[PDB]
Amino acid sequence: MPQPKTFGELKNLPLLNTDKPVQALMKIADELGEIFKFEAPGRVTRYLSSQRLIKEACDESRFDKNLSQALKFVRDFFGDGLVTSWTHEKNWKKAHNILLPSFSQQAMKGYHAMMVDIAVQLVQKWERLNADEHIEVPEDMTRLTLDTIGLCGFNYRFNSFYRDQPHPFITSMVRALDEAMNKLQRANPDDPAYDENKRQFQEDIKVMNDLVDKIIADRKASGEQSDDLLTHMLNGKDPETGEPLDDENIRYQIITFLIAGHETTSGLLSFALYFLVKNPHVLQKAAEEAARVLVDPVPSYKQVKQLKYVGMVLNEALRLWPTAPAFSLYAKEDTVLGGEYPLEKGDELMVLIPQLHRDKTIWGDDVEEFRPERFENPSAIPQHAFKPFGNGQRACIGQQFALHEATLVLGMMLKHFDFEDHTNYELDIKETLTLKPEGFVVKAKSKKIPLGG
Ligand code: HEM
Ligand SMILES: OC(Cn1cncn1)(Cn1cncn1)c1ccc(F)cc1F
């Protein structure tokens, strides 16, 4: 098995002391191929990059979701929420059963109007810019996606478009998640001058939980019936057990959903607009579809479903830069992967999604091209070749929510404005635990098409 450069007792860990660790891992995969061993003090992971190996790893009879180091660290504030619980921890399956109905078609139809509310705020913001002002793309997409999950899920308005900097929840969330990403902290977390970081961390967690408090208080004070995600959290009963979620778990789900529910979707919208401005003929075709399909002053649910090419633009953005770029599995028993690589019970695998999605045996030699037409025919994409939403029963519960919101918003953007890559922007991918273009800016010239209420 290939392995990258080690550094004595630190093994491979210094390779990840960099601003862009996933990009570093992709380069290592480029050098070493479909599988490599990665060791840190205390742990071994095998990174997989080929569809033939990832297909086997996605067999749930042999491999289950693993909580990676990052997932274990963030559990300090995500707790035993859906993202951070083991498949055999009781509260995984219990919450899964209670919340799944909140992501049906019916539920999506119910969220649509509130998705439109936030989308209209974005379009209005851009209509109101003065000559020669520009748009900060990831910043505005984060405003939109946070507000969208807040309002759709919790009936809570973050009012991000009324602030010129991030909502304080975001500012604490980013520092709390960055603290966790500082996983290699002198491999001496109990050092001298981390009392500072540890204090700050608790303060950041407290800011997030005080917002959770307001969400729950506002719900309780409400005179109206919301019938949303929070409703199901508070009231829903697991049909396998008869039980509703306990209070502590509810708080962890709210934090889980507010975070997971916006950050990767902001990244996706930003990457999609990047690839559109860099591929003008693709932009033209998407914009022609938006104009033909979005014939009313605001979009209906059924219209968003008809933006097929827009859907393909999003899927092709997720192919090249899947914004949650890795998920971890473990071997349920001793087994052999790909007829060649023996694994012991409990061994960890990490699926490196961007490399999977560059597997030339699947996608051909145009892997780096942005070509949404690749997705014209679903059945021409082998099982387990495209996995931006994870796998099996632990796959993203929010997938259709993300894609409906992103399709609606990108469609409205393409209907209402012409975009200019005025700086000839050079892609710079900032990594947190997710991926996003940094410093991406455009200019938008309004086509002066009225919006509705
Ligand atoms: C483009 C957007 C998104 C992408 C790329 C994404 C990706 C993923 C991935 C890869 C996983 C599996 C994680 C793992 O195996 O450790 C996952 C799980 C999850 N996602 Fe997403 N997601 C997106 C949007 C959303 C949205 C909008 C929500 C919520 C409204 C959401 C909530 C979750 C939850 C709760 C889980 C845990 C599911 C479980 O194991 O029970 N995600 N997502
Ligand atoms: O998988 C996510 C990605 N993420 C990281 N920061 C924000 N989101 C959560 N998710 C699932 N669908 C959407 N997001 C995750 C991965 C690792 C981790 F520690 C936390 C964490 F939330």
DSSP secondary structure letters along 28-77: HHHHH-SEEEEEETTEEEEEE--HHHHHHHT-TTTEEE---HHHHHHHHH
Yes or no: say if 269 and 406 are a contact pair by the CB < 8 Å rule: yes
Q: Per the structure block, which two tokens stand in for 306?
A: 């008809």
Hey, how many other C-beta atoms are within 10 angstroms of the C-beta on 367? Answer: 15
CA nearest ligand 2 atom 5, residue: 433
Considering every ligand atom shown, identify the ligand nearest to the alpha carbon of residue 265 and give its number.
1
Assigned token pair, 202:
């608790």
Q: Two tokens at 287? A: 């914009």
Nearest to 329 by CA among 1, 70, 45, 75: 45
Closest alpha carbon to 355 in 24, 4, 43, 5: 24
Nearest CA to ligand 2 atom 3: 324
Residues 114, 453: Cα–Cα separation, whole Å = 12
Domain of residue 21: give its range: 1-453
Ligand 2 atom closest to residue 259's alpha carbon, by position in its atom list: 7
Question: Which atom of ligand 1 approaches the CA of 81 most closely?
Answer: 35
In the three-class reduction of DSSP (H, G, I as helix; E, B as strand; rest coil), residue 113 is classed as helix
Instruction: Calculate the alpha carbon distances from 289 to 121, 243, 280 in Å.
Output: 22, 47, 14
Q: What's the CA gap between 227 and 249, in Å, rounded? A: 19
For ligand 1, atom 7: residue with the closest CA = 389
Q: Rounded to an integer, what distance in angstroms lies between the CA atom of residue 393 and that of residue 364? A: 30
Gap between the Cα atoms of 283 and 281, Å rounded: 5
- Residue written as token pair 């607009």: 273
Please name the residue ranges forming H helices in 134-228. Answer: 137-154, 168-181, 195-220
Residue closest via CA to ligand 2's atom 9 equals 260
Amino acid at 273: L
Ligand nearest to C-alpha 268: 1
What CA–CA distance (Å, rounded) separates 124 from 116?
Answer: 12
Residue 131 has φ and ψ, to the nearest 5°, of -55, 135
47 known member of a binding site: yes
Tokens of 129: 């810019």
Q: Would you say the CB of residue 170 lies under 6 angstroms from ligand 2?
A: no
396 lines ligand 2 (CB under 6 A): yes
**Cα–Cα distance between 5 and 28 in angstroms, integer?**
10
The position carrying tokens 């099996």 is: 392
CA 71 to ligand 2 center in whole angstroms? 8
List CB contacts of 144: < 8 A, sequence separation 6 or more: 118, 119, 121, 122, 160, 266, 269, 409
Q: Which residues contact 198 (CB under 8 A, 6 or more apart)?
A: none
> Is-contact 54 41, C-beta < 8 A?
no
The answer to whether the CB of 211 is under 6 A from ligand 2 is no
Rounded CA separation 297/89 (Å): 47
The amino acid that residue 209 corresponds to is: N
CB contact at 8 A, 124 and 453: no
94 touches ligand 1 (CB under 6 Å): no
Active site residues: 264, 389, 396
Nearest-10 crossing angle of helices 168-181, 247-260: 90
Pick the closest to residue 401 from 264, 236, 289, 216 (CA basis).
264
> Distance, CA 14 to ligand 2 centroid (Å)?
23
Elucidation method: X-ray
Calculate Rg over the CA atoms of the chain: 22
CA 266 to chain centre: 8
- Give the atom of ligand 1 at the shortest distance from the alpha carbon of 87: 40
Count: domains in the chain: 1
User: Rounded to the nearest whole angstrom, what is the distance from the C-alpha of residue 324 to the centroid of ligand 2?
Assistant: 6
C-beta of 116 in contact with ligand 1 (< 6 A): no
The continuous run of DSSP H or E covering 417 comes out as strand 417-420
Q: Which ligand is nearest to the CA of 396?
A: 1
Distance of CA 246 to the CA centre of its chain: 26
Rounded to whole angstroms, the Cα distance separating 270 from 412 reads: 14
For ligand 1, mutation pick of 396, 397, 401, 433 (most atoms within 8 Å of CB):
396
Q: Does 84 contact ligand 2 (Cβ within 6 A)?
A: no
103/397 Cα distance (integer angstroms): 7
- Tell me if 357 sits within 8 A of 319, measured CB to CB: yes
Cα-to-chain-centroid distance, residue 453: 30
Q: Which of 162, 179, 76, 75 is nearest to 118 (CA)?
A: 162
CA dist 304 → 34, 179, 203, 289, 301 (Å): 38, 38, 41, 11, 5
Q: Is the CB of 264 under 6 A from ligand 2?
A: yes
Q: Is 396 annotated for ligand binding?
A: yes
- Tokens of residue 361, six digits: 């045996």
- CA distances (Å), origin 361, targets 291, 364, 366: 37, 6, 11
Angle formed by the axes of helices 168-181 and 137-154, to 10°?
110
Taking CA atoms, 250 is separated from 101, 149, 362, in Å, by: 16, 16, 42
Resolution of the determined structure in angstroms stands at 2.0
How far, in Å, CA of 144 to CA of 119, rounded?
Answer: 7
For residue 124, what are its two tokens? 């209005």
- Return the CATH number at 159: 1.10.630.10
How far apart (Å, rounded) are the C-alpha atoms in residues 145 and 263?
7
Q: Would you say how long the chain is, in residues?
A: 453
